[PDB]
Amino acid sequence: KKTPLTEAISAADSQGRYLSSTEIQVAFGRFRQAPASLQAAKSLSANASRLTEGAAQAVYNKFPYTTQQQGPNFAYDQRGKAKCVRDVGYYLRIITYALVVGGTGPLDDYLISGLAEINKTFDLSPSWYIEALKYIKANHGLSGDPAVEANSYIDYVINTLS
Amino acid sequence: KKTPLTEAISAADSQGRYLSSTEIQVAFGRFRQAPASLQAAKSLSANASRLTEGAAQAVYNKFPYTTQQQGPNFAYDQRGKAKCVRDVGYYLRIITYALVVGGTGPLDDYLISGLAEINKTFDLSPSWYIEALKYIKANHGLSGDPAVEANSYIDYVINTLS
Amino acid sequence: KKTPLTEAISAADSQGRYLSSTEIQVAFGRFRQAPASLQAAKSLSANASRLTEGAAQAVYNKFPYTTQQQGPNFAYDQRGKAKCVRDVGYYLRIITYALVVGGTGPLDDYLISGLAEINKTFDLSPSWYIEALKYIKANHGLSGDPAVEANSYIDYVINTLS
Amino acid sequence: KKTPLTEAISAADSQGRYLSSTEIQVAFGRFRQAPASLQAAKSLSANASRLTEGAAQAVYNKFPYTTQQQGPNFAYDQRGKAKCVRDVGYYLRIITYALVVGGTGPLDDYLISGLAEINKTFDLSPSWYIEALKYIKANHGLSGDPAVEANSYIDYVINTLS
Amino acid sequence: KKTPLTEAISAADSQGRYLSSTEIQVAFGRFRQAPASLQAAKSLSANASRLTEGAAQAVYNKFPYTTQQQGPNFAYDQRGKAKCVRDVGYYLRIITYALVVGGTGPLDDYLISGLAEINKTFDLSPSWYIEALKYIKANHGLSGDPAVEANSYIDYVINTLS
Amino acid sequence: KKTPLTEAISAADSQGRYLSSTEIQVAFGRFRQAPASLQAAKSLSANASRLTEGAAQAVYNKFPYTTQQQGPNFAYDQRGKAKCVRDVGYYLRIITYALVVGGTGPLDDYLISGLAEINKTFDLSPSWYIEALKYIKANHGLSGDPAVEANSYIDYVINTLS
Amino acid sequence: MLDAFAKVVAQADTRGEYLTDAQLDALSELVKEGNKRADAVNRITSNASAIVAAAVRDLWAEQPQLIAPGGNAYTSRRAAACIRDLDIILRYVTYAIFAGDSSVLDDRALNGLRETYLALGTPGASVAVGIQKLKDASLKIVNDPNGITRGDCSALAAEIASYFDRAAAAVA
Amino acid sequence: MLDAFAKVVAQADTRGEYLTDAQLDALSELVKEGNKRADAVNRITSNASAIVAAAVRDLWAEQPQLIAPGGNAYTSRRAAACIRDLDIILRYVTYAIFAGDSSVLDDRALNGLRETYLALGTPGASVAVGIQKLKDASLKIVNDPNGITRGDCSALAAEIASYFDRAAAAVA
Amino acid sequence: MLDAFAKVVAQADTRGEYLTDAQLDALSELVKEGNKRADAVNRITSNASAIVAAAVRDLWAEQPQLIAPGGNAYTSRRAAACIRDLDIILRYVTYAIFAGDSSVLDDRALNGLRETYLALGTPGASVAVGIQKLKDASLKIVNDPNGITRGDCSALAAEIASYFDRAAAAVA
Amino acid sequence: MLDAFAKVVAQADTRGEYLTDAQLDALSELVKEGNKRADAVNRITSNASAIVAAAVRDLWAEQPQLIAPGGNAYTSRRAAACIRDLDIILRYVTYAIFAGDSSVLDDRALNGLRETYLALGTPGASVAVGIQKLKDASLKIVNDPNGITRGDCSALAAEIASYFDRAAAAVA
Amino acid sequence: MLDAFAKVVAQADTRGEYLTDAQLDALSELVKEGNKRADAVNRITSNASAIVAAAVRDLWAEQPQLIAPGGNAYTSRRAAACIRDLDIILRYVTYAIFAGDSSVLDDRALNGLRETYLALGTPGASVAVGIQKLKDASLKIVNDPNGITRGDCSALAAEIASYFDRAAAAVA
Amino acid sequence: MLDAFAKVVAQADTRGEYLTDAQLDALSELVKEGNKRADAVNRITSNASAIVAAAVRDLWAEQPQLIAPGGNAYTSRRAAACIRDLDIILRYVTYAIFAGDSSVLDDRALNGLRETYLALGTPGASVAVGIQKLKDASLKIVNDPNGITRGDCSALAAEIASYFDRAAAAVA
């Protein structure tokens, strides 16, 4: 929901006024940056399989006990690993949504709100996902402004987990 | 107060958040529009006398009774004419401020808040200042985005007077 | 709505209490005054045509451009003139309503609320109606208490327009 | 300090409004009534000692046990008797105050606010004072409007006591 | 409604908390005390007839005018005495309810809330029921903890009436 | 702060009420439990060192990576291990506080409030401390009522951790 | 919200017309009867505690199931609420008499009262009986010929009766 | 909060005394001049907008540093706020005239206004001059012989002037 | 609440899918026309007071019974309320243009607006006519070839027209 | 609102009767078993996080469409809200066991809860499956024979089951 | 906020130490005399009306200018306000007795009270005497040997006095 | 409240002057370096949790009395409130970088913070050290030459350091 355009509207509406040249400049900066964004989102979408699978394995690599300890919260079995790949896929997919709209809105509404309660209730460690997000940042291969904005959403999620 | 940069801060702070890439895109379009809009206040400043003196006469030409009706609110005398040219310079100068900050903040804080009370109390017709504003828009000589943004601010004041 | 009787009820009801001898004295004063007001309204009703036609004529004499400049806000045509004498009749008829009830309620509810927005939106000038009301005060020919109370309602409207 | 004049002011101040002819008529009604109101006050004060001692006596006759039962709340002795005539004098004096200002303000503020808490705490029966107030009504000897208004404040206290 | 158990719940619910060992100790306190409370309630119920008629007669002796003066509020007729015994029976029965739940809930909700307005409206003296309550305390014949807890509720109602 | 006696006061004060037999029964059940709680407190204090060392060691054996991975949040060095045993002591000492007061207040105020923020900021896994509390529960050797009230506060902290 | 004068003004504005001479003389006739109207407001107000107490007493003596255990008016809180309702209704009726118009009664007191009593389980028809007794006690006090300048008040008494009847109809 | 009548009542309550005949006659004197008191309230109110506009216009003409860029009354919002302060003071003064007591002016307008202007940076002495111009314009309107039954209003005029001087002394 | 990008993203999340290449290009085609979108917002906003004033003036000329005594737009408060309504709709329509999605207009302005007018007695069908006048004047201002880089805005104009037609359909 | 004692008192007040000797003796029997009641409260509360976590885990594994993209329990916010619902329900059930009465469950948690889920788009029958799983796990913990004085808890266990079944049936 | 147990815990946490064996035994002996403390609370609470009424009665008999016309406790409002203040303090004192700690009295009742009586003009010293009379009556009711198990409450009675004294001190 | 452009505009309005060419050109230089500024906001924001975590870790390691029992940062709540304070300062410093002006830091975070710490007994000098640690970690992250178009950011890093110093001087 939170995009530069919706934030612009919400602000003007809460002040009961028309959009001025201030909010117009918001659209300029958004439409200027959006090709870099929709650019980064097209690459992350194509590389999503190898990125989520590699992120899940990198978590296992830094935290090998997650594939070893017995319990529903862990990836000791196929079910656990499938749950982990699926989670990492959620993170990456919603991160692309944020790129497509140019704001953290999708991250806030679909991923981050309620996340700490989820990670607490199911004994999922935030450090697990931080490492997966670090691997994505280290392997998505983006460059220029698409990489800078993609990394700021990744680090946005990292900041929430820590 | 209200600029692209302060509005972005105000939104993030009211929501208790660090700035995100949404807000950074606000600074991007705004730093893109500034160089031009800035020089476009240097033009308006260098021409302020001519534009103000011209705008005041254009009000007299369209409403000649303002130069004849015997009353303190009118420009029938020297004192009245000085007050009028002063007012027109106030509008133009604060409009140039709006160009400088890329927002209506200066117009809202220095000019429009309290304006209806003023014009009612001192029996000053909004139609006088609309005309003045129309002359400025017709004669400021600006081109491109500088003209458009300046004209948006001129019509912003015209909108609050009608 | 706002009359001596209703304000007495509203004040008591906001305190959740019965009327006392205070509110009776309010009704005694209103009833002592009603006769010279009721007959004021009877005089203003009979002379409404002469007062409103002359009131608009007085505005044209002081502000000749209102019968010359060719815009929709102006009485330069037969249509403009009809709108103007119509307005003045609205002012006068509601002023007599205030006399009938002994309070500014009808003026507040039917005339004054939103009036500043009307005059702004349609480029009607408040001095036009202030001058029309000054003419009505000088020519209604009432005397004694009715003239005083009617003039208070006339000046009440003038106070709103300035 | 609730009077016809303070209520008019407070109502106009609460709405941020100047006084209008509505409130002027309140003052007219108050000044029209004040001669009768003050006359009732002057007669009640002159007969204060007779009315008070007689009202206290009417209570003793109506509730004889208030002079026979031995307790702090009873006038069985001279201490209670002094308290009782003092109390009855408080009621009558504050009642004359209500006539002076033409409103229940003095009664509400000096006598009635908190009265049920004092009676309950010190085991004073409200019936005792209703009987005394009845005797005052039957024995003040006022006629016309000063009687009607005096009896409305007497019945005002009686109502609060029941 | 107000019991040790419901207050424990209402405190934990108002803070969104599960019940902890604090509220469990509330239950232990309630259960340790309940046999003594249930003892007093069974005894008062078995002796309710003689305590109720006896208490109302103690009022008649203490205040003979109640069986003597003629009025709706007085027990001078059979209608009045019936009402009186009913009221005393209400007080005593709701007092046994308090003992049954171990709290003032039944007294607050069924008897005390609105009691001051009832007694004032129908000219019933709090002093009449204080004497009835004093009689019940002096004659219920309880000992030990049941007497202590029963008297606390008796003194609770007396406190309210004074 | 949160004890059976302070909750009883807080509830009565929020209702503007004196204490009643309800709150007295709270103190009764609380004075019934006291000897038990204090016994568990005196034993948990004498055994605190062996419980704290053993609980940390139980975490090391369940999650061996906590003594291996080289990072500030881990107990791979002596500094870490010291921090870890310090934390278990904090949990244990404040749990005994909860027994002394018969309520979760000390746990809420000294340990739990802001605990989740700390574990996330410093990358401390809640499973580490849950496992330590499990070791304390199965090794304090308490019996009877001191056992289950001690285990309730233990499971209380475990609930805020999961 | 409205009194007798504002009502006519409000009706005149919807037609955009001045008050006719007939409408003014009618309003002037109400002013002439203004002292009788003050007497009605002062007399009902000066007796309102007794009027209400008599109303709930007679109503409860009439329908003992209301105050019997399990009844809508049983316990002190609900008895006090029942007393307060008949007081509130009488208070607004005194307003309507003072205004010479029932709008204050309709707008602030009666609107939604039927639906309110249904949601409560309070017998609205039993409230109507209590309102009838508020009316009977009030009219006898208004028509009291002692201590007042003797004259005709039948028209005002009919108007007052219409306010009570209007309140009794609106509760069920 | 208090009018002239309530002021006397309150003072008599501290003594626990009934009002004397001199006090009852003093207040009866104020009732007799109530028409003059209503004219003064009506006349000031009826020209309130013009009185305020003239007070700020003349004040600003004498002290142009107030309106000049950077002045306390510079910008449209502070210019309006300056107009609003004088209109507020004029409104409360008409309350006091209507009441015959300055308590409403003291309790609701003057109390702390001296310290408010100090915190804001508003030159209180300039406000006092603006009040003095409200007073001069108001008294001229009150004492206007046209359109009124000619009579003596010098006592009322002096009462009005004290209210304005009180307000002027409270801001400096 | 939603812009054109979030509309696509929200629909993708319910499917749990990444946006396709065609979807990203389709959205990218929109961003490339961002300057025409910004002109439509700026051009309508810069003329809103004149657009609304013309709309209500033409509507009341076509339907004089709205402003005749007794009409829904008679009295200054109702007349000003009617002007505000058309200005409110115009404002939310420029919101929708700016966002490339009508959700802000649907959720915050149009949702339940017909039922509000029916409860008020405001002729919704007459509001629809007033909306159509806002639409004709806005499109004429948006499509003005003077003072702007000449180009094709027909696709955007159709989109702007759909927001007005949607607003009109909601009240007619 | 009510515990087991207050429940019997509320019914006796509507009849205007003292409690019978049998009614008192029944309540004295609930008091004698209060320790088991406290154990059931302590034991459920002490395992609430694990009971809720296992309730939603088994529910979502039995009904994977709920957490699949677009499902009601999909996204982190809705998955958390679903956990909270079962946690809240279990919390009110422990209130009900502690009070020996279901009024706190009915009045505060179940009242209108069915309709809430109907207006939210939440499958009520899925909540009931979640509640049934709170029941099974809780009873297995209440009846855990280790670390507690052995005795008969079958009647209390049956009362605990009725609370869960009451909540499951209220949401279906 | 604190009882006697939490106060010792709070001081031990600031030192990061467990409670010593003596500190536990000291808190144990406080528990062993909890019945006396429960009586002190119940006896004062059961007689709270008579204690307050006797306290104001003797206070006003000692200081007649408090209730004389103009007095700080003259008029019903001030007389009820004076009764209320002593009742509030007495309740907060029984709060302190129950907790065996003065925090609830200090934090919620005495915090800012002396300043309040200074802003009001109320004689703190007269209030301090009323408190002392609350203490006087309360202590004679706690120490009353009839209808209670004979024993030694001197330590508790000393504790009760310090709370009253604490309250008297903070207002003088 | 103000960005770098508004602060110069606010100063010019107090003079009633247009900006000089030097003032306009100076602001053009700021605009030209805006990419560096955006990186500074992005880089500090993208590391805020790590920067704050390292700041309290290094502060509490240099001053263990803060975390030792009884210390100001002892207990989980006060440790968390201490982390929060550093996180808030860092957030408002990032606001000041983004705006090129400290007004949002001064008005919203720093105004009265020294008095707040004194009232709580929090060592203002210890907070300043933590802010210095916030500064050092943030500057090294901004000056990180990796993954960025290399350039000179020394003037911006000098400006960023002054916001931290300003906050540090305001609590010490």
Ligand SMILES: CCC1=C(C)/C(=C/C2=NC(=C\c3[nH]c(/C=C4\NC(=O)[C@H](C)[C@H]4CC)c(C)c3CCC(=O)O)/C(CCC(=O)O)=C2C)NC1=O
């Ligand atoms: C819910 C209502 C309720 C309350 C409040 C209550 C209090 C209470 N007071 C007690 C007795 C006792 N009570 C007192 C109190 C005192 N003896 C004196 O002579 C002093 C005047 C006074 C000082 C306060 C003493 C000294 C004892 C004996 C030792 C003890 O048990 O504390 C006991 C133990 C049983 C007994 O001996 O009576 C209880 C439970 N019981 C109830 O059911």
Ligand code: NA
């Ligand atoms: Na004009």
